[PDB]
Design a protein around this nucleic acid. Structure first.
Lengths: 146, 171, 257
RNA sequence: AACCUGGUUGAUCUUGCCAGUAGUCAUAUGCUUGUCUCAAAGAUUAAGCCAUGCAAGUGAAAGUAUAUAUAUAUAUAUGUAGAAACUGCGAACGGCUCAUUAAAACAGUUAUAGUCUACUUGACAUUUAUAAGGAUAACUACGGAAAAGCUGUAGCUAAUACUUGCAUUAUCCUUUUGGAUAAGUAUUUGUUAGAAGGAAUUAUAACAAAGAAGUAACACGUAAAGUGUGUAUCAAUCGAGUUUCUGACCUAUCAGCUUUUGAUGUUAGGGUAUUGGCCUAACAUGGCUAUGACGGGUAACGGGGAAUUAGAGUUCGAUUCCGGAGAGGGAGCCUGA
RNA sequence: UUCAAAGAAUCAUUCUUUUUAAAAUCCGAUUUUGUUACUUUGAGUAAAUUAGAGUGUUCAAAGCAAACAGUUAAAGCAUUGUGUUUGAAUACUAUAGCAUGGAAUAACAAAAUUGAACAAGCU
RNA sequence: AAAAACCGUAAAUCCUAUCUUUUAAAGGAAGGAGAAGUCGUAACAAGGUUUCCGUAGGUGAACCUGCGGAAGGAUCAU
RNA sequence: AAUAGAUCCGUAACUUCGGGAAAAGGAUUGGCUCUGAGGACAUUAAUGUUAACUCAGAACUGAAACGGACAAGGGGA
């Protein structure tokens, strides 16, 4: 259940013998999710359960892809100003983020993520909060000012 | 030996300048065998010494349900979650599963509790069966190629049941 | 190799050092020590460019060889020694006492002070940390470590250290009535009563300061040095008294003579 | 200074370019040249090749002197110095160049709660002693080689070179005072309690195991006790490595790239100073792209900046400063912070 | 999808102040009420260069200096001598990032084949 | 201490392949420039068959012919 | 005479787009000891009984040899 393949993080600080489930607060205005607080999953890279600390900067984005295990692709859309023509142009760049199983995401959901230490070759952000959002058409084709 | 020469995030090849720096370094692995204690000294950055253990046979091992540690000797290597070649060649790594002599622990139990702080944890049958066998299962918890010593803890409960099932619906 | 750089080009030197472009290629790289190179001056320019006692680096060395100058009443013989944001200099042969302060244009000036005045040092604590045995040490802007500080002392407080013994005498807090001196900003050198402390979670906390003439200026909390309580500053201030005047009407006082 | 003029016709009005015009911290060159100040200068092509000589050395109290020389009251004591050499530190800075390099480097903006950090500064330490051991340079004698910043053998000798190694404190209580109790700095593992930060598996504390390295067998002398050198840890400082967000020229007669050969991610480990496919094993099929991926070109190091600017712009930036990279081309490695 | 009226002040107008729905704080009166773009102020911005303040390098390019009485001393201040008065400012440092006032203009969110809030009882 | 082996870091040389840049070439076939070549007369006038377009065939050359268009036509019109 | 099986890789001009093609051209192959993957059958999410040779990977080993004999394209313009 909690672990199926040959994979279990110790969940350091869980304590199993004497003590008096482990979770942190993350802070920064975010609320540790109830599913994280009372769940059974074990994630080494979860902001609320593992060793990772959220520090750096906070960003928002559309979930573009959730096809890999516990990580997602977040596309951030923004307007780049071209001085010569005195107008803007739509520009984008997608960033990969880790997504703990406490969060339930789909393509098109709007997530706010916080920077953490480099967890893989390309991921440096952990999703801190998810809001459901219905998308019509391709998620890449969507454009949101965040 | 770190950082560059990989493909970009997109899959594009990156033109390389900036020939290899020393601080990337990348020393060869320590394949810590099981045998007579020999370690070597590695001078890392800042003249900080790292103890690369070529072979160990004993180690500090902890009974965690009682929160004690006693110095025992490693008998055999029986599992590791990574490549099976490591157990087959009997190499000690940070999460290896080893067979540990139980006698120091059983003697300590006799001396402190009597009969075979916050005491009286009631024990379990699945571990004292191994104790009667004389040899017990333990998981390494240190990094022998980094600290120069193999230390670990007895596995009990669900994790022990898991590892026993993995070692032995099964053959 | 790429070890630490040991030279400082003149045009790369800090601006408040006031090193003329044409007077050489290099600047005296301050040795590592109590204060950052950016927010300190070396003794070479303290005794060569400000007091004009020396006409050259060799003359500065000649001064330092005789154990005459002291920084925080102990002998210093390093030419590139950081003096610091505020601290006492004693020239024994000429009997005189200085404190390094900022004028309202953010430049380090030696303020003449009295012998009795030259025993008090205002140190801005920067870190409070407990080591083995639950002993609390305060790391100050000067870079000293003061153990067994009073528990009431907080991170941004200031302490009045006795120079000869290195003991705290009294501490000052950071209320909205506490007067402060600004350290590195556009408003470096001003002295004001703290309008308020706008604290924002995760970024620089800003604090607003009222001058004597009710002019408000905001600054990063790291650029603030509590100098007194609401009664009076605990140090004599340079002749400007930490009041920055508008450029338009400083010209009026320049013209009237 | 927000400017135009000659040229298509037999003549006209247009479009439209050619030519004229001025500047260039923009180079070359022709002619000419009396003063003074001021000052760029082998970048362009050949990051082509180099004779010669110099460019990083260092001892004024403070490691080691019977090479040796000298001086004061009487073979003595103080000395003054000191060739050489050992030891220490520096030579990783500086100076030069711009070949490489196109989200790379660089710039602004973050993080390091993912790390290392010599000199310097502040704190400050723990499991034969009227002072311990061998062995070496310099030096002496005998040599080898055409030659080299080559060195063999034998004999001596020191050092802050190399290596051994000599108390004490804290806590409980009748309660100034008496007895009782206890003794590892970093670092690693297991079980726990928990001033600050935005958030801690933080500081710290307790229990159980290991355990580095050290806490001076060292040198010179200031008030009518000092300094030097060396040392464990913490902090500061001088820095570095990684790192977040955003920003680049031309080209689609480059449209699909990446993925066995790590590509994207999970898990475990190895490695590192630390995080990380950085590497390995298993597993899943991911990742980027017409908002231009992947390619190609650049007679492309990036920026601060330069020229020309009414305003917009266009063009340049090898070159004072900063960052990067390199030492004929590659690769590897020792010492060392 | 929240619009005006009343007063003090230049010359004949302009210019400044207050309220007038509703829900949670204060016993007739005390006070918060989407997100962003955008815009305003800040913060933090190396110098050199640039703009620019001051300064007769004999002028100027410059530089960051300098100026003041003294055919031979008064003054200031020191309780007998100690020179004194100064400057080396400000601005700029993207478009991105941090903080911040915001009424307009733009988006997005929430909004019914239905969704709320209040009172009482029950858990 | 020589020396050896094995993983690794990996210069360098060779073979093969691909690409980029430059370049030789019998012959072929364009374009441009020549002060004054030969042949015709295609276009500009209804240019002596109105011109022109697309397309197809043919001819020494300009060009000619068929089909369908245009007026930029020689018709703004019983 | 030259290889010639099989596995993995790589494969041009040209083209009637089907081919060319086994193009060209590289690498590997034994033995041994192991590791992994691929099914069927019964009990009150859970534990036993049992079968094919087929693939993939790793250590070791040898006079560097392994389609060991047999069998078995020379390619290209």
């Amino acid at each position: 259940d909690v672990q199926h393949e040959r994979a279990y993080q110790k969940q350091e600080g869980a304590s199993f013998f004497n003590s008096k489930r482990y979770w942190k607060k993350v802070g920064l205005g975010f609320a540790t999710p109830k599913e994280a607080k009372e769940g059974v999953y074990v994630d080494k890279k979860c902001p609320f359960t593992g060793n990772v600390s959220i520090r750096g900067r906070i960003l928002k984005g559309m979930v573009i892809s959730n096809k890999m295990k516990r990580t997602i692709i977040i596309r951030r859309n923004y307007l780049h100003y071209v001085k010569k023509y005195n107008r803007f142009e739509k520009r984008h760049k997608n960033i990969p983020c880790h997504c703990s199983p406490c969060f339930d995401v789909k393509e098109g959901d709007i997530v706010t993520v916080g920077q953490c230490r480099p967890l893989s070759k390309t991921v440096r952000f952990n999703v801190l909060h998810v809001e459901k959002h219905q998308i019509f058409g391709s998620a890449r084709k969507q454009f949101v000012l965040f | 030996r770190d950082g560059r020469h990989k493909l970009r995030l997109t899959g594009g090849k990156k033109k390389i300048h900036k020939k290899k720096r020393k601080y990337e370094l990348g020393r060869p692995p320590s394949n810590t065998k099981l045998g007579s204690r020999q370690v070597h000294v590695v001078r890392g950055r800042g003249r900080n010494y790292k103890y690369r253990a070529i072979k160990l046979d004993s180690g500090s091992f902890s009974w965690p349900t009682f929160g004690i540690s006693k110095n025992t000797r490693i008998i055999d290597v029986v599992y590791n979650a990574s490549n099976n070649e490591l157990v087959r060649t009997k190499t000690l790594v940070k999460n290896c599963i080893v067979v540990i002599d139980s006698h120091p622990f059983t003697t300590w139990y006799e001396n402190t509790f009597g009969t075979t702080i916050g005491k009286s944890k009631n024990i379990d049958p699945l571990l004292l069966e191994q104790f009667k066998q004389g040899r017990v299962l333990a998981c390494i918890s240190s990094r022998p190629g980094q600290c120069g010593k193999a230390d670990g803890y007895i596995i009990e409960g669900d994790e022990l049941l898991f590892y026993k099932r993995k070692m032995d619906k099964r053959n | 190799g790429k070890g630490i750089k040991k030279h400082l080009k003149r045009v790369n030197a800090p601006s408040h050092w006031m090193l003329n472009k044409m007077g050489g290629q290099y600047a005296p790289k301050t040795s590592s020590g109590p204060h950052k190179l950016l927010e300190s001056i070396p003794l070479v320019i303290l005794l060569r460019n400000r007091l004009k006692y020396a006409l050259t680096f060799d003359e500065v060395k000649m001064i330092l060889i005789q154990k005459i100058v002291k920084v925080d009443n102990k002998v210093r013989t390093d030419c590139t020694f950081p003096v610091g944001l505020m601290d006492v200099i004693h020239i024994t042969k000429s009997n005189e006492y200085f404190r390094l302060l900022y004028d309202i244009k953010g430049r380090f000036v030696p303020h003449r002070i009295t012998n009795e005045e030259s025993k008090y040092k205002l140190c801005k604590v920067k870190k409070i940390l407990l080591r083995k045995g639950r002993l609390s040490i305060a790391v100050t802007h000067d870079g000293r470590s003061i153990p067994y500080i009073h528990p009431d002392v907080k991170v941004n407080d200031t302490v009045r250290l006795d120079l000869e013994t290195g003991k705290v005498l009294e501490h000052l807090k950071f209320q909205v009535g506490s007067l402060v001196m600004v350290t590195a900003g556009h408003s470096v050198g001003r002295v004001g009563v703290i309008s308020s402390i706008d604290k924002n979670m995760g970024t620089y906390d800003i604090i607003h300061v009222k001058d004597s003439r009710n002019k408000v200026f905001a600054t990063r909390l790291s650029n603030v040095f509590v100098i007194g309580d609401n009664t009076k500053p605990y140090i004599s201030l340079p002749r400007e008294k930490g009041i920055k005047l508008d450029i338009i009407e400083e010209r009026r006082n320049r013209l009237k003579a």
